[PDB]
Structures are given as C-alpha cells and as structure tokens.
C-alpha cells in the first residue's frame, strides 16, 4: 500500500536502471556502456524489465 | 480512521452502482456508521463494537434514552472534532486558539482502545489497573492471572463483547 510518491522513490533505486546484455550488470538509467571489465565495457544494454 | 473510511466508501460505491436507486423497493442500502449498520473489532480475540455501544456508555456517563443514543452516533462519526482541553464538540478542524483538534472517532472511541492496547502491551500494571476501574469492567479468576496478549484478549472480550 505504498503511496505513489514513495513508490517512485523506491523504484529509483530498484527499477529505473539499465542492464548489460553480456554480464547482467545493474547500471544507472543513462548508461551507454557497462562499467565492468569482464564484458569489455560493451554498449549492448537493455532496460531493466518492468513488472508491468 | 482513514482506513475505515476508504472501506466504507468502497462498499458504498459497489452497492450504489450495481444496486438499485434510493427510491427503489428496498429503500436505502448505503451503510453509514452513524446509523450503526457497520461494526468493528476482531473475531479471533472475541471482541467487537459499534457506534451504538460507545454511545451507550457516554450517555450513561452523561424512548428518550434511545433518542439520545441515536443523535450521539451522528456526533461520534464524521469530520467533526472534539476538543480535549475544552471538553466540547466542534465543527472546525482548528480551535479558536489554532490548535489542530482530533476528530471524534479517534478522540473518544479509538483513544480508549489504544490506551487499553498500549497499557497491556507495555505491561504497565498500574495503568492497566486504573484503566480497568475507569472502564468498570469485571474480571473473574483464572483470567486475571494471565498477562500480555492473552490478558488483552480477556479484557477486550468483556469490555466490548
């Protein structure tokens, strides 16, 4: 029963993020490259999928 | 109080959309706590109450008796605020001084229940004792010995059967 304003606050840290397609890393929503060495900083990123 | 109001509104819109009109054969279907058509409480602990019961005990603290209980219900529920210090009802949210006033439901119905719950859950022996005397409840043996949540069950079960 989280109110919408708090619900957006939690989703800022849990949901509004990008995911590396090679190494699944959790990245900030404006990311263009992965920050991780093990994938080679690939630009192959996808949005984190919503529960919607 | 807000949780109670949202549920009452949700039930009302259900029985107003799918239901028939007020001028229908049944009459008025919409439920209102001021009418005493809705109760509160817990079935597991065996205690429940209505606006009817609390109007009865405040009339006793204060036919013609049934009439005075009825119009007391309309004052126990709603957006009407009871000043604790002044000791009188009011229609304004703020006092003439400017203090925000608690509504009647929380101030003189929920407050005794919250005080009872707080005292028993915090094991305040003196506070529970004086609350029992003020609420003039009877406590038989084999149940006065128990303490904590079972003591809360026994106390509430007879205060609000």
């Amino acid at each position: 029963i989280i109110e919408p304003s708090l619900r957006q606050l939690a989703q800022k840290y849990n949901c509004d993020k990008m995911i590396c397609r090679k190494c699944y890393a959790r990245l900030h929503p404006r990311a263009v490259n992965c920050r991780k060495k093990k994938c080679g900083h690939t630009n192959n990123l996808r949005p984190k999928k919503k529960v919607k | 109080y807000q949780t109670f109001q949202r549920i009452v509104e949700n039930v009302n819109v259900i029985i107003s959309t799918y239901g028939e009109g007020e001028s229908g054969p049944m009459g008025n279907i919409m439920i209102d706590p001021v009418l005493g058509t809705v109760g509160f409480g817990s079935g597991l602990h065996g205690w429940a109450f209505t606006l009817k019961q609390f109007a009865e005990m405040y009339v006793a603290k204060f036919a013609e008796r049934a009439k005075k209980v009825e119009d007391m219900m309309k004052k126990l529920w709603g957006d009407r605020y009871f000043d604790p210090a002044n000791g009188k009802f009011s229609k304004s949210a703020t006092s003439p001084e400017g203090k925000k006033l608690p509504r009647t439901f929380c101030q003189l119905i929920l407050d005794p229940i919250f005080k009872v719950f707080d005292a028993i859950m915090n094991f305040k022996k003196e506070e529970t004792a004086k609350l029992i005397e003020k609420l003039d409840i009877k406590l038989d043996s084999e149940d006065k010995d128990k303490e904590g949540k079972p003591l809360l069950k026994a106390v509430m079960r007879r205060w609000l059967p």
Partner: protein
C-alpha cells in the same frame, strides 16, 4: 534551408518594423500553442504578433539601427521569453482586450502553482466510479442521489508548490478552473518611447 529560414526572418522583422511604428514588447508566460492561436485569431483583424529568438531580434535591430535610429532603446530590454505585437490602434484598447481574452489554462502536473485553489463542498455530478481519485487525495466523499458528493471543503493546492499528478487528474476531472495566465505586456514602444 536553415540559412534561408534565418534570412527570411530578418526580412520579416525589418519590414514589419518599417510598416508598424507602434508596438508592445510582451513576455510570454507558460502559454500553449492553443493559447497563442487564440490570441492570434483575436488580434487577426487589426494587429500582428511576431515571436522568435531574442538573438534573432537583437541582431536584426542592430543592423537596422543606422537606417532607423531610436530603436536602440529596445536593445537593453529584449531578454527572456518575449516577443512583439504590432498595431496601429491605441494603447488602452490593445491592453484591455489583451487582458480580456485570457484563457483558463488547465493544471499540468509537474508545474508550480501560482494560485491557491480550494474545492467547494458540492455534489460533483460524476458517477460513483471516480471515487478512487478522491481517495488518493484523502478527500472523504459519500454517495448522494447516485452521484459523488463532497462533504466538506478541502484546501487542495497552496501558493508556490508543485502540482501532483493526482491533483492534476482531479482538476481535469471536475473541470474547475485552475491557475490561469496569458501573455503580459512588459513595456511599450510608441514611436520611440518607454512606458509601463
């Protein structure tokens, strides 16, 4: 095509200044494209409204300064979201009709609210299925005559606070007038003059 668009703007402003010697500088508030078209039709008979880049204007005026002096008074004034309206009519007639053709702009979520609004205690006339919006705002409503009724006045939006999405949908739901604003006359130019 961008170069031709800029040169066409320069020819437009220069010719329009030559033809019209009397004009208002007006600052545009948060006015929509509907709002600008509403003003444009209301003034279409006799006046003309020209808006654009400030740097477009200021460069054009400086180039035309030698050809037509006394325009340099506009130079330390064209700042912010402003434009001109050109007219051959009198100051008062332009001003009071431009203040009369205002618009009840809707309350957009995520925008500051200059005005303070408060809902009256009246039957909304809406069906008993829009109760969820009232519950989000915490407004205690009841069903009377088969329609939603507000039991008491609720102070909804204060002055100078951001309008929430739930408030914005409710304002657009009850259709009541929110804060409303249009274009406001910054100053004047009566053949080389400055007034209020």
């Amino acid at each position: 095509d961008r170069a031709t668009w800029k040169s066409n703007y320069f020819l437009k402003i220069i010719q329009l200044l030559d033809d019209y010697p009397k004009c208002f500088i007006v600052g545009a508030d948060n006015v929509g494209s509907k709002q600008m078209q509403q003003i444009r039709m209301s003034l279409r008979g006799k006046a003309v409204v020209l808006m654009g880049k400030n740097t477009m204007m200021r460069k054009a005026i400086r180039g035309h300064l030698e050809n037509n002096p006394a325009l340099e008074k506009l130079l330390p004034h064209i700042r912010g979201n402003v434009g001109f309206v050109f007219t051959k009519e009198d100051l008062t007639e332009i001003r009071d009709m431009l203040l009369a053709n205002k618009v009840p702009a809707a309350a957009r979520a995520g925008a500051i609210a200059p005005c303070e609004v408060t809902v009256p205690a009246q039957n909304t006339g809406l069906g008993p299925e829009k109760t969820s919006f009232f519950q989000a705002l915490g407004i205690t409503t009841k069903i009377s005559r088969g329609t939603i009724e507000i039991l008491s006045d609720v102070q909804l939006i204060k002055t100078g606070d951001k309008v929430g999405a739930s408030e914005a949908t409710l304002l657009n739901m009850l259709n009541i007038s929110p804060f409303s604003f249009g274009l406001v006359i910054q100053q004047v130019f009566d053949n080389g003059s400055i007034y209020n």
